[PDB]
Each structure stands twice: as structure tokens, then as C-alpha cells.
Design a protein around this ligand. Structure first.
Ligand SMILES: [Pt+2]
Ligand SMILES: [Pt+2]
Length: 167
């Protein structure tokens, strides 16, 4: 039975949709533009891989911190929780996950394109995206807890982000 915990349930619902979408986008690379062995082509591939590696670290970082905010904001006996604040933090997580996915598709694309292999990247991105969802599942005001469930979820985010960063 809920209050303006219902306001939170909606945000979680909206962010879960966003996550499941990002999660679907991670089955494949972006189609690259027509490149070849043109020198230019080469600077383009390179410049994009850098920015993409950077942008991704930035977004994962914002992921682990949002997760940490979710855990801290959701602890301490409900009936005191700032539900709107929890809401804003899960918005930070999901919003970032969306952008992380675009980045990783491009980067996996670039690895793959040049003899590398991007599947693991894509896989590990999927990995992070699914742990993100397990977390939003547990942060749902209607959960019959128990607290440990939410903690193990916050800890899986971090573990998947970890593996993700090893590219
Ligand atoms: Pt859901
Ligand atoms: Pt690269």
C-alpha cells in the first residue's frame, strides 16, 4: 500500500523502460560511415575511439555514483526516505545508461571494424544494463524487501561496471 511512493514507482517504471531499450540496442554496432584506408579515414576512426572511451568512463562513473546515491538515500527505515531524491538519482542512472549505449555501440563498431572484436564490449555493456535493471527492480517502493536484496544489487552494478571498464 503506497503514498507518493507512487511518484517514485512511475519514475522507476519510466527508467526501466529506458533501460530495457538501451539493453536491446546492445545486440549490434552502429553502422559506420564509408571509411576505407584513406589517411583521413584513419584520423576519424582514431579521434572517435578516444572520445568514446572517455565519454563511456564518464557515464559509467555517473552510473556507480547514482547507484551509491540510491543505496544511501534508500536506507534508514522508509517512512523517512526522500522518495523524490531517490527518483532523481535513478533518473541520473538510466539517463546515463542510455548514452553509455550509444557510445559503446560506436566503440565496439570501431574495434570490430579494425580486426578487433566488439562482441565482449557489447556483452559487458549488456551486463551493466541488466544489473542496472535488477537494481531498479529492488528500489521499487512496493518491494517486499528485504534490504539485503537491494544491497546485492547495488553491488552487482559495480561489478558489471568494473568488467565493462576493462573494455
Ligand atoms: Pt520494470
Ligand atoms: Pt581504439
Amino acid at each position: 500500500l503506497t503514498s507518493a511512493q507512487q511518484a517514485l514507482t512511475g519514475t522507476i517504471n519510466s527508467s526501466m523502460q529506458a533501460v530495457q531499450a538501451a539493453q536491446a540496442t546492445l545486440d549490434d554496432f552502429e553502422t559506420l560511415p564509408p571509411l576505407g584506408q584513406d589517411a583521413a579515414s584513419k584520423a576519424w576512426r582514431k579521434n572517435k575511439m578516444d572520445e568514446s572511451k572517455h565519454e563511456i568512463h564518464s557515464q559509467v562513473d555517473a552510473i556507480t555514483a547514482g547507484t551509491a546515491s540510491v543505496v544511501n538515500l534508500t536506507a534508514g527505515d522508509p517512512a523517512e526516505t526522500d522518495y523524490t531524491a531517490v527518483g532523481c538519482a535513478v533518473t541520473t542512472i538510466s539517463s546515463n545508461l542510455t548514452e553509455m549505449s550509444r557510445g559503446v555501440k560506436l566503440l565496439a563498431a570501431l574495434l570490430e571494424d579494425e580486426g578487433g572484436n566488439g562482441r565482449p564490449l557489447l556483452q559487458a555493456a549488456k551486463g551493466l544494463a541488466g544489473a542496472v535493471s535488477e537494481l531498479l527492480r529492488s528500489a521499487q517502493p512496493a518491494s517486499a524487501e528485504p534490504r539485503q536484496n537491494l544491497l546485492q544489487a547495488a553491488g552487482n552494478v559495480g561489478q558489471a561496471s568494473g568488467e565493462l571498464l576493462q573494455q
